[PDB]
Design an enzyme around this catalytic site. Structure first.
Site, short mmCIF file in Angstrom:
data_model
loop_
_atom_site.label_atom_id
_atom_site.label_comp_id
_atom_site.label_asym_id
_atom_site.label_seq_id
_atom_site.Cartn_x
_atom_site.Cartn_y
_atom_site.Cartn_z
N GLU A 1 0.81 -1.21 0.00
CA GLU A 1 0.00 0.00 0.00
C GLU A 1 0.85 1.27 0.00
O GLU A 1 1.91 1.31 0.62
CB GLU A 1 -0.88 -0.02 1.26
CG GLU A 1 -2.02 1.00 1.34
CD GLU A 1 -2.63 1.01 2.73
OE1 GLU A 1 -3.83 1.32 2.89
OE2 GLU A 1 -1.88 0.71 3.68
N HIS B 1 2.36 4.69 0.96
CA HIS B 1 2.62 5.30 2.25
C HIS B 1 3.27 6.67 2.06
O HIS B 1 4.33 6.95 2.62
CB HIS B 1 3.53 4.40 3.11
CG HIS B 1 2.79 3.30 3.81
ND1 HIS B 1 2.32 2.18 3.16
CD2 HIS B 1 2.40 3.18 5.10
CE1 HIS B 1 1.68 1.41 4.01
NE2 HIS B 1 1.71 1.99 5.20
N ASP C 1 3.61 -2.12 5.69
CA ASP C 1 2.71 -2.99 6.45
C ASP C 1 3.17 -4.43 6.58
O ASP C 1 2.65 -5.18 7.42
CB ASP C 1 1.30 -2.95 5.83
CG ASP C 1 0.60 -1.64 6.07
OD1 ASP C 1 1.18 -0.79 6.79
OD2 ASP C 1 -0.51 -1.45 5.56
N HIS D 1 -1.85 -3.93 8.86
CA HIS D 1 -2.71 -3.18 7.93
C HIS D 1 -4.13 -3.23 8.50
O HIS D 1 -4.82 -4.25 8.41
CB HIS D 1 -2.65 -3.84 6.54
CG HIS D 1 -3.56 -3.24 5.52
ND1 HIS D 1 -3.50 -1.91 5.14
CD2 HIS D 1 -4.50 -3.81 4.73
CE1 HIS D 1 -4.36 -1.69 4.17
NE2 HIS D 1 -4.98 -2.83 3.89
N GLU E 1 -7.15 -2.42 7.73
CA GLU E 1 -8.25 -2.96 6.93
C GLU E 1 -8.37 -4.49 6.91
O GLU E 1 -9.44 -5.01 6.58
CB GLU E 1 -8.16 -2.42 5.50
CG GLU E 1 -8.45 -0.91 5.37
CD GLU E 1 -7.23 -0.02 5.61
OE1 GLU E 1 -6.34 -0.39 6.41
OE2 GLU E 1 -7.17 1.07 4.99
N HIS F 1 -1.77 6.85 9.34
CA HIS F 1 -1.24 6.30 8.09
C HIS F 1 -0.13 7.13 7.46
O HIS F 1 -0.37 8.23 6.95
CB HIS F 1 -2.35 6.09 7.06
CG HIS F 1 -1.88 5.44 5.80
ND1 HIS F 1 -1.37 4.16 5.77
CD2 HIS F 1 -1.81 5.91 4.53
CE1 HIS F 1 -1.00 3.87 4.53
NE2 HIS F 1 -1.26 4.91 3.76
N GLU G 1 4.54 5.03 12.08
CA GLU G 1 5.20 4.07 11.20
C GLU G 1 6.51 4.61 10.66
O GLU G 1 7.47 3.87 10.49
CB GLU G 1 4.32 3.72 10.00
CG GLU G 1 2.94 3.27 10.33
CD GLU G 1 2.14 3.02 9.08
OE1 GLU G 1 2.12 1.87 8.62
OE2 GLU G 1 1.56 3.99 8.54
CL CL Z 1 -2.04 0.94 8.81
MN MN Z 2 -2.22 -0.10 5.84
ZN ZN Z 3 0.69 1.35 7.11
#
Ligand code: CL
Ligand code: MN
Ligand code: ZN
Ligand code: CL
Ligand code: CL
Ligand code: CL
Ligand code: CL
Ligand code: CL
Ligand code: MN
Ligand code: MN
Ligand code: MN
Ligand code: MN
Ligand code: MN
Ligand code: ZN
Ligand code: ZN
Ligand code: ZN
Ligand code: ZN
Ligand code: ZN
Lengths: 256, 256, 257, 257, 256, 257
Positions: free
Chosen positions: D32, D34, D43, D118, D120, D176, D181
């Protein structure tokens, strides 16, 4: 209340703990029912019948399924009408299967599925089979299911004579016709507008089906027969016959 | 009436033909809500909110989904409780997907999905994505969906203050707590009995989840917080706040 | 040469479809018990035989038939607890029908007749068709037409029914392994029918509801729902001509040249 | 030798499981976007790095991580309309989780930790677990235990939050590609992070509802939901120790020797 | 880097925007590979080959699939071995399908799928067909896929001679044998301990398969042939041959 | 008496299974183009014929064959772009095999031979078997055994190969609509073969990889992968005898009295 939804989980737990608990599941549909009747008829009727039967035999009624399988031309007019909102077969099959799995988890073992939408039949049957298959893998073989369409309990010639003094033309054309309209007049009169009925001749079809569904082969109103002669009195009779017959059948299959 | 199920298909066809028709779909669940409240709370509440919002903005309400996804321990107490009757994810996903496909067929293009059961969220999201994917393949890209939880509209500190004059512990423990019970006292008094409320301390959990779900980690009554302080007054306030907020949100996303 | 697609080379099939108005027929049957007197592939044999004759009469082709169908139901086929009966889940049958339609459309074919010979298959055939047509629409195809029918539905004439049931007709609901299919089998595959093995039991009767798990005690022991004692080759010849003529006319009507 | 199952021979793995109390760890990530400043496999890298250290500390093993996760959602990952982000349908992720559990149970393993990186993926991971356990139950196995956690949930101490967000913490819903992170990546994979590319935009805010199809205008252009300008390897080192310690203790508590 | 996972979305977007970008997807498995090698061999090798090929032609490599289809006795020893962790066919097929759908959404149109696990073959093919079927519905017919197993590019008799001076006995026995171990010795020596190799005679089977799989029909170590004659030198040869052969194949199918 | 389950009554079938040592055989074919010289149902006809002869010799029974198989692949069947070829999706074929095994187990049968006549079905048949056995295991059944084989794999002996390809053997990877199958057909269904249509083209060859969408230009126009000009009834009769004998022995070996 006989409606599971209106009970606390403690009250439900106690009823099932009794070991003789019978559960009833209305399976309907959101489908057009002519110019003179609402679209939730298939949910309203089996639910009302379930209510009365449950009160007589001490059973409980589960929340009814609001959406059913795709309307078929020869039985419900066809899935091309607006308003009618249908599920795919796998969806309906899955819903029935999941509920049975959950009821078995609760410890319930007696279920009556009351269908009010003809097209639901075989997917209800597959849902039951898939569920019972899983229960066997889990060591359970005492879960019993009775499936029925309430209308099937109106076979007495004498009763038919009353309902159709001019003669009966068969159940195949009973979509939004005399039968359901009469039941609705006896239960939910405010949802019926009898003056809007289109008095067309009974729908007739050749011995086959065509896809994609051809709108021209279904009476414009969506009904397969005229409800012009429907009445509360007819509805009264139907309700009594159905309630009494079904109550007896359930007592027979799930003896106290 | 604002209920699609109560309309004839002709009446429905005309509302959609107008071209500005907004449809609302309540998605709930049959889930235990403690010793003091019925199990269909997740359906009753979002349906009541939809009804009121619909009346103010001229929208229609579809029959609500009676069964939702498996109750989770940190949100609904857990799916080991009796009464709770849950669907598998694919089943709930398919139901939402099928309904959207059908609404698009009617010519409808504006849908508000009002969730009343936290666990339903991601499967509702997948149902929407799969349906929209299909619609694109069919050449349709103007179908718009608004997804919301009525509770998320109660954020005004002044309101939270009036609701929790002792302090707000968060929404994570509201299952069968002050919020829902107060709404039920205002909407369905006969389905609530505060005398049965078990006044236990708020449920707390470690930063992880365990499966199989351990019953010992959920308060015995099934609630995650006490509804002792719940009241009709609180319910009336909550209701008016949500109705007004959601109505504005819809007027914003689906401008007349 | 033959009306069966399976006996044609891909070039021959290709040429026939190139005609522009080629009709294809698909028999959908089952492997199911049919009493002590008949073989278990009756539901495949009968519609396949009717398709063959109809196809020959109107210039259509016949696809290989589906040998396995949906679970036998007590009030229509006796029940899925009998040995021999080998059934598919609903999803399996629906997908088979869907796949075949997708493939025929890829060939350029646009006319299909599905002839069901096993009652229980009906709704899964319907779902397979809808899912396939839905898919075709996404691909920009809305001219694929399907006619679905059960050959027995073409026997309606009262005069015909009286000749078949001189003692009085008791409805189609109890016909599994009865006079109707047995008569047809006597005329088409006499080698696969032993009428001397018929158990002449009274017509099966059921309450207005169904029970699951299926209860073996509610189905006559032989598996038949009515006695085929009065079945005969002559009755079968009558049924065949009525079905073939009725179906052939229906196709000319729906799929004109 | 290594804590990674993929780097062991089947004999080595077999010996570990034979111990009778071997804990396995499965990182579940995603590919994904970032933001402009970090690579797209964050992730996967992060939960895998946390698993590695935890496994080393408590004597557990780490299974190959899931490289693809569920569709990115606007309010948590920016939205699935971004290039690069490569997502699976829910059924696909659920089935992958289910198959792995079925297989681990066949090895004789009975203790699994699923570390999600992640957001989701959450509910699809949950359904995979339930379907797998349902199945194990049909096979007579009821002693398989699963612990599901998102490593970020272990940073709860206010004193820690204060060090990470001295200017004030604004909730995890906007993290996010933010400070959290990014800091971990600075400490673990410095070559894969270019802090000079960070776009210092205000925290993303949304109304109390979601809209589909996803509207690109409601997500900050860079893809991030909050600015990682104040990120640092020291913050990352703090986060890592807090997570490794908290998770290691949780596993010893749920999976004692 | 040539690995998509190590790039930011902006960099990836830029490379696809060029309009000629080629993507590579390694597809492996977690499978037992004898007493002498690690179990992620089918992931490591194809990924290593992709990296070197990608570096020479300007392509990019997607995160590899770590789990493949169930191991079959005649090819991988069987799925009764511990450590081996396999997916059901539908799962693997769906994974491939989903990725292609997303790459198409990105605007990519050239994909090379490098299988490193023989048993994945047919499910990869189905995943590709279902994905392309879907793209057609969306109006996309310019997405192209090349499927290949790096081993198939080592056919030259000369190279075979150098690799098998004592004569090659076929590929159907090359599981954890000379070919793979030689590649590993050259690429991941630390994940190989040649002193553990069990020098057993080549595995042979009747002209049919049996289910449930029969353990006794697979060499005890899990290998189908001894890798005693494996070496880093051989690996280097194989590697360069494969890297070159594949690079040329891609240049031809996806002409610059 | 017949060896085909379809031609038996359920009572006769029940009796044969009641014996306790009944072996069943399921032909799995496809509707696929086979050049300009043969019909499209070759993959059903051949395995079915072999099954009948084997069944007669060992006392086994043959189930109705699966008429539709998996999608044709260029390097094996020529490609699924040809008209006539009617293929199922993988899940459909897998589910069909799974359902039949579930039902056979319910009858009490425990020994099944699956004879494949369509190369591309292979892995989907394998998955169907695994899912069915997984299921049987949940039901408490572990004594159900399946033998999967392709009749063509029993013709390896150099003595026969030499006799079949005296001019030189080039492998089986090119045997689609060629000498092997055409010879069998000439010996079993001569009326469904017309050697005068055989297109004598050079054996097909492809690079070491596959391309999708399938490129028609990579398949010999006729759809065949190798000429069948040297095919003959004599050769077919040899193959048939060899296969029937070898398979019968293999079955005796796996399902001993
Ligand atoms: Cl995330
Ligand atoms: Mn994610
Ligand atoms: Zn992430
Ligand atoms: Cl109805
Ligand atoms: Cl809730
Ligand atoms: Cl029938
Ligand atoms: Cl391999
Ligand atoms: Cl073949
Ligand atoms: Mn209806
Ligand atoms: Mn809830
Ligand atoms: Mn039948
Ligand atoms: Mn492998
Ligand atoms: Mn073939
Ligand atoms: Zn109705
Ligand atoms: Zn609630
Ligand atoms: Zn029949
Ligand atoms: Zn390998
Ligand atoms: Zn062939």
């Amino acid at each position: 209340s006989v409606f599971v939804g209106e009970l606390t989980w403690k009250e439900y737990e106690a009823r099932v703990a009794a070991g003789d608990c019978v559960l009833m599941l209305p399976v309907g549909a959101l489908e057009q029912h002519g110019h003179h009747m609402c679209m939730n008829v298939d949910v309203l009727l089996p639910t009302a019948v379930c209510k009365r039967v449950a009160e007589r035999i001490g059973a409980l009624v589960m929340p009814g399924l609001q959406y059913g399988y795709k309307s078929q031309q020869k039985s419900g007019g066809g899935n091309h009408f607006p308003g009618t909102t249908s599920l795919d077969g796998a969806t309906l099959t899955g819903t029935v299967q999941d509920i049975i799995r959950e009821l078995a988890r609760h410890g319930a073992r007696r279920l009556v599925l009351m269908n009010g939408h003809y097209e639901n039949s075989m997917f209800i049957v597959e849902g039951i089979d898939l569920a019972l298959r899983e229960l066997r893998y889990a060591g359970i073989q005492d879960f019993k299911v009775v499936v029925l369409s309430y209308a099937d309990f109106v076979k007495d010639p004498a009763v038919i004579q009353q309902l159709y003094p001019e003669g009966f033309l068969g159940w195949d054309i009973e979509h939004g016709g005399v039968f359901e309209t009469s039941l609705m007049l006896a239960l939910y009169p405010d949802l019926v507008d009898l003056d809007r009925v289109v008095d067309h001749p009974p729908a007739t079809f050749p011995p086959y089906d065509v896809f994609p569904v051809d709108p021209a082969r279904t009476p414009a109103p969506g009904t397969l027969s005229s409800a012009k002669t429907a009445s509360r009195e007819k509805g009264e009779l139907i309700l009594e016959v159905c309630v009494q017959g079904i109550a007896d059948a359930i007592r027979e299959e799930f003896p106290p």
